[PDB]
Ligand binder design. Sequence first.
Ligand SMILES: NC(=O)C1=CN([C@@H]2O[C@H](COP(=O)(O)OP(=O)(O)OC[C@H]3O[C@@H](n4cnc5c(N)ncnc54)[C@H](OP(=O)(O)O)[C@@H]3O)[C@@H](O)[C@H]2O)C=CC1
Ligand SMILES: NC(=O)C1=CN([C@@H]2O[C@H](COP(=O)(O)OP(=O)(O)OC[C@H]3O[C@@H](n4cnc5c(N)ncnc54)[C@H](OP(=O)(O)O)[C@@H]3O)[C@@H](O)[C@H]2O)C=CC1
Ligand SMILES: C[C@@H](Nc1nc(N[C@H](C)C2CC2)nc(-c2cccc(C(F)(F)F)n2)n1)C1CC1
Lengths: 413, 415
Amino acid sequence: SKKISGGSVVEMQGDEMTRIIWELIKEKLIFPYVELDLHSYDLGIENRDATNDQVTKDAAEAIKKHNVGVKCATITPDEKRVEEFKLKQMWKSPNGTIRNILGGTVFREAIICKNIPRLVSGWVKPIIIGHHAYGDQYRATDFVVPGPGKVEITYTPSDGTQKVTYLVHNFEEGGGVAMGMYNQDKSIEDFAHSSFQMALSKGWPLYLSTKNTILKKYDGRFKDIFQEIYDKQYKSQFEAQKIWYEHRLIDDMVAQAMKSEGGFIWACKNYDGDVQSDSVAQGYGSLGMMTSVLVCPDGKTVEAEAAHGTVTRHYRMYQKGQETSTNPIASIFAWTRGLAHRAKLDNNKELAFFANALEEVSIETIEAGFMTKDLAACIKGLPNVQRSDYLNTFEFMDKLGENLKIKLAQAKL
Amino acid sequence: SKKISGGSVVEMQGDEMTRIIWELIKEKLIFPYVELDLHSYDLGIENRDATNDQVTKDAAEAIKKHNVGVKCATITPDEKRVEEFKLKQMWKSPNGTIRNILGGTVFREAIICKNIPRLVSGWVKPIIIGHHAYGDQYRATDFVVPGPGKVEITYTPSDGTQKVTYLVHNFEEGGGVAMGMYNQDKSIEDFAHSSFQMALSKGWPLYLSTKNTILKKYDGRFKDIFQEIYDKQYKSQFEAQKIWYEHRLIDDMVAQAMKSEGGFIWACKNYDGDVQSDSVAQGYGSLGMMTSVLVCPDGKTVEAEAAHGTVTRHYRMYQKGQETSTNPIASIFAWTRGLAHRAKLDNNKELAFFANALEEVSIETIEAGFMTKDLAACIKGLPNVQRSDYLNTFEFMDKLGENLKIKLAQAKLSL
Ligand SMILES: NC(=O)C1=CN([C@@H]2O[C@H](COP(=O)(O)OP(=O)(O)OC[C@H]3O[C@@H](n4cnc5c(N)ncnc54)[C@H](OP(=O)(O)O)[C@@H]3O)[C@@H](O)[C@H]2O)C=CC1
Ligand SMILES: NC(=O)C1=CN([C@@H]2O[C@H](COP(=O)(O)OP(=O)(O)OC[C@H]3O[C@@H](n4cnc5c(N)ncnc54)[C@H](OP(=O)(O)O)[C@@H]3O)[C@@H](O)[C@H]2O)C=CC1
Ligand SMILES: C[C@@H](Nc1nc(N[C@H](C)C2CC2)nc(-c2cccc(C(F)(F)F)n2)n1)C1CC1
């Protein structure tokens, strides 16, 4: 039938294997059924170098303008990759630039298929982890104490008066290490607002984990800010949807997440959520099933992408003309989450139906027995997987396109 | 008939339900078969308040003297229990005093029973977690920044050399929080030595998790100290037992433990291991299956105990004469680990055999379907647990005693 009017969507192309999969997704799953007003920005390392990383800021401002962006996995430069593509500078992570310009919080969620076993058996519903990516250990000032001496940390108000001196330690036996770290009230407030809005959107309870029994001033501030914002702006909206917010001790938090069935938002400090990420990805199965959504404190602008990288090994294989089996679920769901938020903003029933139908097609295709090699490894175990247990990248994309056409034709019966 | 010669052992008596189970373990499992030279010390809160915590120092020094101590779970006073017992001072945790006097490191391990389900699928062997319980967030100065201003951190050498001032942050809009924390070289060195000695004692590889990709100076110190001590004093000893040591990112370490099957020593910083403890005990099953061993850097002195507490709720039920189902496996294994180290130091063949036999009897008794209520809930799920699925405390202790007598009598019967 007719194409669904999508609206303004900021698209950002990426690098390598995820870029090939991105083109496949656009050609076979989106454009045949959706007419979009695309604002494309090639965030590949090639075009990010030729523009001195201006295209990244342009795409971030386009997201600020149009409230919804979908992003392909991009190469983050390091020492070896500057020599690989012969770059000028070692440009910063595009994800970090977009995160700073937008000022939101990233939430990771695993896509569940009933036939894909999980390392934590009881997990039935997703555990959406929101990660405060500012300050703490990641903006700290650490140094080696080489000998006996005094380590103090001081606070001096801007007008110069009434300095407060906190004696950290007095080394009289050899040396050791010391460090000071900080965090901002504004960043914590943005983090709390994003977490509350994410919980209200997903319709799930919200938990914040700290160690305020030990760090009574430091983590107590996180607890206080979350509680103030909750009681003043979100309590009634939570109780209406029969959800709730609670502060938890990080010990209790990881324990209860270990023995729960899932289905909640978990707001973590920088170190905690960063330590998680990989582990939750492992516990749910494959990285190709993990999506990320950057939500802003206003709850209006959303930037969706896959939580995995560009899958460099599979691209290295694909360059030689070898058979690859790369999971596209996370990128497809980046597209579907972007389109679903677009439909919510535009009051678009057809686009909402299409995005949900694409998610259902993906999950049903996997649950019926068609999957890539990583999910087949989750089922059978890596050494026991054979070529007949999975489809390759292009075979799986073809199957998804077939089933999507079938379901959207049944949207006319 | 004749008992086994056990040697010198420092015993520390405890509080409440673990004290009851402690007396039961001594009466039914240890004393009938082993004659010990027991240096006993009552670490009950009553006696501890009567002597102003001096019995704790005495017991720690006795452990330092005799190299082996077995400890019952003790009450760490707080706001409530000072009023409960009419305490003079709010006495410090006995575990902390003993640890600081001995200068060792605590290693926690869960006891596996093949019929007890685990929350992580592939877990077959135990993951022994070593906790560096000093410094970092647990000895930090944290504070609220009420408004704009500088937060700096300075190092002032005591010899007289130049000060060093680093900028932590400059608050220009609003305020926030700040904190300073530290660690010490000798503490990290003792931590490393205890971890290496523990790995050599268990015959398992050792992994040290840090975040030195972010804190290149702070955690890099841990990495460098561990590597220096390993290369200088334990490389060939590790290679002989076909084991290894490795540094790991905390991310990769948690994920590896996720998809691992177990069988390695995991040395953690304060925050890491402290956060892990409860979740690890939950993932392997019940808390009553969790043991801890205090291992000193010299590798000579060892102090075993249960990882759980005095189980206060079960003790309240016991006081009112109600039926309880407390798991004694952790305290039994405290005794068996103490006796195993005793037999290792004294080359005591028979005592080592007895300790291993008691551990085997415990594991086999549970695997035969005779368990306390917590393991029964691990199998069936707490709501689906009926009275016929488990035994109470004294029934379980009596069954253990019967099976132990049978095993030792058949060991003599063989020859
Ligand atoms: N969102 C972003 O823009 C991000 C980008 N990156 C960038 O990506 C690049 C590659 O990073 P890398 O370390 O390889 O990590 P990746 O996440 O790209 O992949 C690492 C491994 O995970 C498995 N894997 C990940 N995604 C998939 C998938 N969709 N389907 C199947 N298997 C998958 C593969 O395992 P196996 O080898 O067993 O097949 C792969 O080798 C780097 O330049 C990095 O900077 C990294 C993180 C986030
Ligand atoms: N090693 C030591 O000396 C330690 C001592 N303590 C002290 O112990 C006291 C009580 O501590 P608490 O908070 O109750 O923690 P506990 O570890 O004593 O027990 C808490 C709960 O865990 C379960 N549990 C623990 N051990 C067993 C066991 N052997 N068999 C069956 N279930 C068990 C019970 O759950 P349920 O109610 O569901 O049956 C119990 O109610 C406090 O005064 C504390 O300071 C605390 C920690 C360590
Ligand atoms: C996903 C998983 N999370 C989790 N698990 C564990 N240990 C379990 C026993 C192993 C991994 C299997 N340890 C941490 C962990 C470790 C260090 C620091 C932090 C902090 F920084 F976040 F505080 N967290 N995290 C939940 C338990 C399912």
